[PDB]
Design a protein around this ligand. Sequence first.
Ligand SMILES: OC[C@H]1O[C@@H](O[C@@H]2[C@@H](O)[C@H](O[C@@H]3[C@@H](O)[C@H](O[C@@H]4[C@@H](O)[C@H](O[C@@H]5[C@@H](O)[C@H](O[C@@H]6[C@@H](O)[C@H](O[C@@H]7[C@@H](O)[C@H](O[C@@H]8[C@@H](O)[C@H](O[C@@H]9[C@@H](O)[C@H](O[C@@H]%10[C@@H](O)[C@H](O)O[C@H](CO)[C@H]%10O)O[C@H](CO)[C@H]9O)O[C@H](CO)[C@H]8O)O[C@H](CO)[C@H]7O)O[C@H](CO)[C@H]6O)O[C@H](CO)[C@H]5O)O[C@H](CO)[C@H]4O)O[C@H](CO)[C@H]3O)O[C@H](CO)[C@H]2O)[C@H](O)[C@@H](O)[C@@H]1O
Ligand SMILES: OC[C@H]1O[C@@H](O[C@@H]2[C@@H](O)[C@H](O[C@@H]3[C@@H](O)[C@@H](O)O[C@H](CO)[C@H]3O)O[C@H](CO)[C@H]2O)[C@H](O)[C@@H](O)[C@@H]1O
Ligand SMILES: OC[C@H]1O[C@@H](O[C@@H]2[C@@H](O)[C@H](O)O[C@H](CO)[C@H]2O)[C@H](O)[C@@H](O)[C@@H]1O
Length: 752
Amino acid sequence: MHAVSVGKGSYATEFPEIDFGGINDPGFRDQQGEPPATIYRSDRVTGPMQTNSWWGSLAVDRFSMNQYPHPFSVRHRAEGLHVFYDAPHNMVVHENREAGTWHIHGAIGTDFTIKHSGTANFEQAVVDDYNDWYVRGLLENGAHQMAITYGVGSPYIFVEYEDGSAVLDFDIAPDVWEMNGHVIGFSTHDHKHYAAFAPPGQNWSGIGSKTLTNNADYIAIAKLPEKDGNMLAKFEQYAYSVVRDAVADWTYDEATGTVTTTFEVTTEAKVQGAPDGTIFALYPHQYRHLASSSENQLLQNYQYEIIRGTMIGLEGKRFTTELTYPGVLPSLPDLGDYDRERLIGYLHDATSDYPTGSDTYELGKYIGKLATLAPIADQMGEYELAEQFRGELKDILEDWLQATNASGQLKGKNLFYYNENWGTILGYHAAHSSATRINDHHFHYGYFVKAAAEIARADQEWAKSENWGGMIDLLIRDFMADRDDDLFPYLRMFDPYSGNSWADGLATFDAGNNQESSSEAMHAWTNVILWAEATGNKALRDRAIYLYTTEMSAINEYFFDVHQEIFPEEYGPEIVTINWGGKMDHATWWNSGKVEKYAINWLPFHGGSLYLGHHPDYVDRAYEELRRDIGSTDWNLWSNLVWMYRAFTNPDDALQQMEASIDDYGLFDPGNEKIIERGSTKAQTYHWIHNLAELGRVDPTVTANHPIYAVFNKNGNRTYIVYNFSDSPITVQFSDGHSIQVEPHSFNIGNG
Ligand SMILES: OC[C@H]1O[C@@H](O[C@@H]2[C@@H](O)[C@H](O[C@@H]3[C@@H](O)[C@H](O[C@@H]4[C@@H](O)[C@H](O[C@@H]5[C@@H](O)[C@H](O[C@@H]6[C@@H](O)[C@H](O[C@@H]7[C@@H](O)[C@H](O[C@@H]8[C@@H](O)[C@H](O[C@@H]9[C@@H](O)[C@H](O[C@@H]%10[C@@H](O)[C@H](O)O[C@H](CO)[C@H]%10O)O[C@H](CO)[C@H]9O)O[C@H](CO)[C@H]8O)O[C@H](CO)[C@H]7O)O[C@H](CO)[C@H]6O)O[C@H](CO)[C@H]5O)O[C@H](CO)[C@H]4O)O[C@H](CO)[C@H]3O)O[C@H](CO)[C@H]2O)[C@H](O)[C@@H](O)[C@@H]1O
Ligand SMILES: OC[C@H]1O[C@@H](O[C@@H]2[C@@H](O)[C@H](O[C@@H]3[C@@H](O)[C@@H](O)O[C@H](CO)[C@H]3O)O[C@H](CO)[C@H]2O)[C@H](O)[C@@H](O)[C@@H]1O
Ligand SMILES: OC[C@H]1O[C@@H](O[C@@H]2[C@@H](O)[C@H](O)O[C@H](CO)[C@H]2O)[C@H](O)[C@@H](O)[C@@H]1O
């Protein structure tokens, strides 16, 4: 057998003979491959391999690339582990005016190297263990081993030796300003403050020289917030508690909308009586939302400066964050003051649209487009057109979700394949290194889930597990599996601690991992919420709610900097386009103009997009900066996306710009995205802007006791929107005291 049946569909278990469709282009052909054969992991790491992580380069490269376990940067090498900290003098903000790009970055330097007394010629560094956000890297050379435990949000690096002892090697002799024998407080020549800890009685030697040595088979390194002896004493308390387990456990309180996440470590004692706990370094998206019960654990003056702003210290076994899920919708309802016949015209115009490629991404954009059009067609009373759209979605999905052709043999394209080596579903044709690097599975498969959710909204039978739902559930498991999934690692895309998704499967860059389109991540989470609600899968829905809500908190900090605290004052733009572990760029992965470096973090527009309007002052600030740089409202590309975004705070302005230019060009044209972005339509644009004009501003201050809703506020007048996926009527309670009844399979208002 070369395929596994899942309901009416199947996935391939053997790499297919790819149908290249006569395309000779080497770039295209190279995309139709598999992720690396070699995984640098020990035999202690078994089953589906974790990917899309901040630490991924350890698994892919023989050693590693540069990594960002904030507050540190580290890299594995034959000689040992290089440790670095970007001080203010290491940080730069550069603009390339001609490219239209900006870059906030540090250096790839070495403050010191953690070394093993027995060898400076390790053969490889492997993943020996990992948990929700820490990794254990193992440098190996026969009997000589050095195990390094580190993580994002850990001011400790824990070092365990086999057949040797500790060495810290420096290019310029450090200033050892506190010598407690087994504990040392030290500074680099350029005044970066660190500490090293060994068991009592194991004293440091070589003070005043370039090489600090210790006979111990265990040391910890800490980054100190300050050259402060009291802080050193505090770090000493947790320096011998090596993190083994780390979990981010969450709950969703449906009644209140509260997503509660508890981050909990389990440590192993390296000396008698070492506490079960650590010192955490919290990111802004965490500490801005710290639970009251965690406040007492904060170490107030323990601050670290990093790319993502200020980290703060917190001591103990666990801490808790509290966030608010704002709801999502399957679409905007029919509440706009549009010319209905004009909208009908645009809906029929959209039948000329076609996918601009055969790969999962371009096909994804097309099916997202059709899924967006179908509820608008329904609302306008174009019921057969809506059915045509959903029929076309059915045809496409029923093709892609089957791995075998009529003869029973594997297809050459439009299929999914399970790579057993890593443990991931890959789609062919592939693009953006979705197969070769395990990239972007949330971005691509999110569109497939969108299509499935729209089908399920009208046809529950299709969506059943024994029919086509099984295969959709498989795609979702690939990118956001629960724990103990036999086929996939836990929550592939998501970093529970950094608070965001990472797009690159391999992370083999010296800036760590990256994410560009945070909105396509949010699109994926939205669609899983919708799909799971439609198919009555509460556990899956809640997981997607947790992801949507957490990612939102990271987006507002690191992509948007809504609070105006993170980006350097000298940084011109009002958005970071690509977030990396170690840097921030106003730039795109492809060659683009001015609009795209903003709008790649807005697209696509859908019923889960309302998170983009929670901060009206930000929306204004970002729009005004883009307008300033353009010099007018003559957008270089994707005009409709700018209008839709503008409509969050000024729909009159959005409407005026739309009226002037929407009809500039006629039917679908792949070569011309000046007015209409290729994943968008005139129909969507017109429907969105007019809806916003009537509804007013997004109102995030009101929650509901059901998950599929939105609240708008126009000069004090609230509009409450709920979609009911149930066969039964429901009552929804809003947090401001308002209450509504909703009929089965309908909006409460604006069904059309
Ligand atoms: O249905 C399917 C459909 O599919 C189609 O198939 C397609 C197919 O067409 C295509 O074919 C290819 C052709 O398209 C191609 O034609 C090109 C054309 O693309 C190009 O366009 C130019 C634009 O690309 C360009 O855009 C700019 C962006 O590129 C730029 O992106 C930047 C990133 O670069 C940057 O990345 C950095 C990263 O580099 C860095 O990496 C580190 C390494 O450098 C380092 O190396 C070390 C070294 O440092 C040391 O000194 O030495 C050692 C030596 O051993 C070395 O190892 O290693 C470290 C790790 O240790 C690395 O880290 O890492 C950092 C992070 O750490 C990373 O940042 O990242 C930034 C973001 O941060 C990103 O912005 O960005 C700018 C700004 O936005 C952008 O402008 O722009 C110019 C114009 O200005 C364009 O010209 O043009 C050329 C020339 O005209 C064309 O040739 O040709 C190739 C063949 O060569 C084809 O493959 O292929 C795709 C798949 O790829 C396929 O899907 C079919 O066609 C279709 O029919 C079908 O229907
Ligand atoms: O307008 C023609 C122009 O379009 C370009 O397509 C871009 C995509 O390259 C871009 O890909 C994004 C990725 O960089 C990453 O964020 O992940 C997903 C894909 O996995 C995408 O968000 O997406 C935008 C928006 O859909 C597209 O406009 C072509 O690359 C370029 O060659 C072409 O000239
Ligand atoms: O890293 C995730 C992103 O990767 C992008 O592709 C990269 C190529 O453009 C570049 O030439 O090479 C690197 C590997 O060295 C690729 O990762 C994708 O286009 C993005 O969609 C993706 O998010």
